[PDB]
């Protein structure tokens, strides 16, 4: 067609140009290649983290700069380098493009569109490695984030800003629950108060093609992929692919949050992105340091989820909510992979395989599920509602724990068990479902404040969806109120109660 | 301006165009509905009227 | 239909690589390596003689 005959000319004009403006200002000669890390002689003053340009066409990178040989890992098939190849070097540290075009793109690790929905428009080039704001610069996190699971996700809250992780087995709905965030945070960035617009970016670090396919069909099918990006390395490509996909994601999330917009970014089972970080250190000459890991696997899990922060109103009060994923192999957090990202993060989401398989879609467990954002960070009419609860539920489960011990006045005679099992069964929901924040207080307010005493476990899937349906046809009232005002006052709570025990008899 | 060898543009807008009036509303809930309520007030007020004297008695 | 057109576009592209594939191969038997040896040449003269 007409662009691309210009486009062709132009670029190989500049290509012409670059060949004849300081040679290439250096090269190298290739030593050794395999599992994407590349041995190269020559780069005598070749810069740190560099990319570099090989004669076949595949992309790299300088992890280790050795007297003589230079460590480069392969960014792509190392199918196309042989030995001997001209490595030419790009003389700018690794970057990724990075602005308000990338919203409605996937894009590769390097930031080239893999999507084929043409080029990508950025305002500029960030280093895929960045150093995370300061203390002064980051800022208590306060704004909080819908998370729109109706679930332990809403009591104690993820909010703006925090590394809330997400812990459980394979298949138990850590996707599931990013998803539905994701899903979730239209209601609010399809408006135009950009303070309150959630942009997502998507991390589908080691994921099949196929599933990422399938997750961006069912963004666009809820019109979520407007706002979200899908920058990510799937299985097919190269380790350093998946090593360096998060990290660019982190350099497109501080770009949103250096220009004051608020993003949230789910760095989807960074396992993968570990492994492959052992893939390169193994045949890259680092030595393992614990468990076969090589040691800075703690430090890059370090330096990738503290970019992730709430910047304070000097750098513009933008956010960078952070949602890591981690495949535990058996429910096992006391692993070493998980020991440090639990370390790492502001909390975390535990999905056990039980849970999962018992029922409960969600599969979150109560009593290990932390955060630090508590009773904060929250919409306010939930914080007061469910500011402790999850303290309650965790002795509701010690208690049950205890009243099967032995027979004694506990069970059905406790009115702390029944109120932790009837809070249980109500923190629950369906995939796909995003439930706005007005429509999950009353029946955590039913739950906590004992109005559920007499509506029997079986009946609570039951109720949650008929009080639903009371609040949004006949007492819209004081639901709008709390979705407007963001929180319960003294005549809001007087109303949810009055609501609350009009609807307790039925 | 998105499609550039639409073709069918034209075709659906004027398919939406003479689509529009579907057919009269009925709008004609006046010959059994008004029966029944008429029924309705008239043994309502006769009920009220004897549960009032018997209310009395 | 913008999906179709879509889809041309993608196709319109591959058919252009084929196109452009095959004239390379075609440049690849046709005598067209001396005049373009003395071109670069030169431009690599020039490119020297730049710095
Ligand atoms: N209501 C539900 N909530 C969550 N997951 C559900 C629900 N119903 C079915 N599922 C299934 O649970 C799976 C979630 O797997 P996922 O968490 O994406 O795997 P992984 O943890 O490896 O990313 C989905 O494939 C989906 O088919
Ligand atoms: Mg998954």
Same mark, same amino acid.
């Given at each position: ?21 300081? *040679? ?16 190269? +002689? ?11 340009? +090989? ?68 305002? =500029? ?5 960045? /150093? ?18 109706? #679930? ?9 800003? !925090? ?20 899903? *979730?945070? /239209? ?20 994921? /099949?093609?196929? %599933?990422?396919? !399938?997750?961006?069909? %069912?963004?666009? !099918? ?6 979200? &990006? $899908?920058?990510?390395? %799937? ?9 360096? #996909? ?5 350099? &497109? ?11 949230? &970014? ?31 696997? +703690? ?9 992730? #922060? ?38 975390? $989401? +535990? ?72 809070? %249980?069964?109500?923190?629950? !929901? ?16 039913? =739950? ?33 109120? $709390? ?24 | ?57 | ?51």
């Amino acid at each position: 067609k007409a662009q691309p005959t210009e486009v062709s000319s132009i670029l190989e004009e500049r290509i012409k140009g670059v060949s004849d403006e300081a *040679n290439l200002n250096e090269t190298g000669r290739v030593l050794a290649v395999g599992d994407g890390i590349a041995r190269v +002689f020559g780069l005598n003053n070749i810069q740190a983290e560099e990319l570099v340009e +090989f004669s076949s066409g595949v992309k790299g990178m300088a992890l280790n700069l050795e007297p003589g040989q230079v460590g480069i890992v392969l960014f792509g098939s190392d199918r196309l380098v042989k030995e001997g190849e001209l490595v030419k070097r790009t003389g700018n540290i690794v970057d990724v493009p990075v602005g308000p075009g990338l919203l409605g793109r996937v894009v590769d690790a390097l930031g080239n569109p893999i999507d084929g929905k043409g080029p990508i428009d950025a305002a =500029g080039r960030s280093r895929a490695q960045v /150093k995370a704001p300061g203390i002064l610069p980051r800022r208590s996190v306060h704004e909080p984030v819908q998370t729109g699971l109706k #679930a332990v996700d809403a009591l104690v809250p993820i909010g703006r800003g !925090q590394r809330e992780l997400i812990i459980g087995d394979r298949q138990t709905g850590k996707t599931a629950v990013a998803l539905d965030t994701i899903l *979730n945070q /239209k209601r609010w960035n399809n408006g135009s108060d950009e303070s309150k617009k959630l942009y997502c970016v998507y991390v589908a670090v080691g994921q /099949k093609r196929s %599933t990422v396919a !399938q997750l961006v069909q %069912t963004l666009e !099918q809820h019109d979520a992929m407007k706002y979200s &990006i $899908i920058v990510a390395a %799937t299985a097919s490509e190269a380790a350093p692919l998946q090593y360096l #996909a998060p990290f660019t994601a982190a350099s &497109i999330g501080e770009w949103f949050r250096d220009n004051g917009k608020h993003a949230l &970014i789910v760095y989807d089972d960074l396992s993968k992105q570990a492994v492959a970080y052992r893939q390169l250190s193994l045949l890259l000459r680092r030595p393992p340091g614990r468990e076969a890991y090589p040691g800075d696997v +703690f430090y890059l899990h370090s330096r990738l989820l503290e970019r992730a #922060a709430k910047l304070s109103e000097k750098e513009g009060s933008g956010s960078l909510t952070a949602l890591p994923v981690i495949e535990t192999q058996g429910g096992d957090v006391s692993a070493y992979i998980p020991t440090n990202v639990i370390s790492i993060t502001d909390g975390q $989401i +535990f999905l056990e395989a039980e849970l999962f398989y018992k029922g409960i879609r969600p599969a979150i467990n109560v009593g290990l599920s932390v955060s630090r954002v508590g009773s904060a960070a929250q919409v306010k009419a939930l914080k007061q509602v469910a500011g402790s609860l999850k303290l309650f539920l965790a002795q509701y489960r010690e208690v049950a724990a205890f009243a099967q011990f032995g027979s004694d006045l506990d069970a059905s005679t406790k009115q702390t068990l029944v109120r932790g099992e009837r809070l %249980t069964q109500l923190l629950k !929901q369906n995939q796909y479902s995003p439930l706005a924040t007005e429509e999950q207080v009353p029946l955590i307010y039913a =739950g906590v404040n004992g109005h559920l005493d007499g509506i029997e476990l079986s009946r609570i899937g039951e109720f949650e969806s008929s009080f639903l349906s009371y609040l949004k046809s006949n007492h819209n009232e004081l639901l709008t109120e $709390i979705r407007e005002k963001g929180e319960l006052s003294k005549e809001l709570l007087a109303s949810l109660k009055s609501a609350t025990e009009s609807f307790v008899a039925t | 301006s998105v499609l550039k060898n639409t073709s069918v543009i034209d075709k659906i807008e004027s398919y939406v165009k003479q689509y529009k009036p579907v057919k009269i509303d009925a709008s004609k809930q006046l010959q059994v509905i008004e029966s029944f309520e008429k029924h309705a007030m008239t043994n309502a007020k006769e009920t009220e009227s004897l549960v009032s004297k018997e209310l009395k008695d | 239909w913008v999906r179709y057109e879509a889809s041309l576009r993608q196709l319109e592209q591959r058919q252009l690589a084929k196109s452009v594939v095959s004239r390379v191969q075609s440049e690849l038997g046709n005598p067209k390596f001396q005049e373009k040896v003395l071109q670069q040449s030169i431009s690599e003269i020039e490119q020297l003689l730049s710095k």
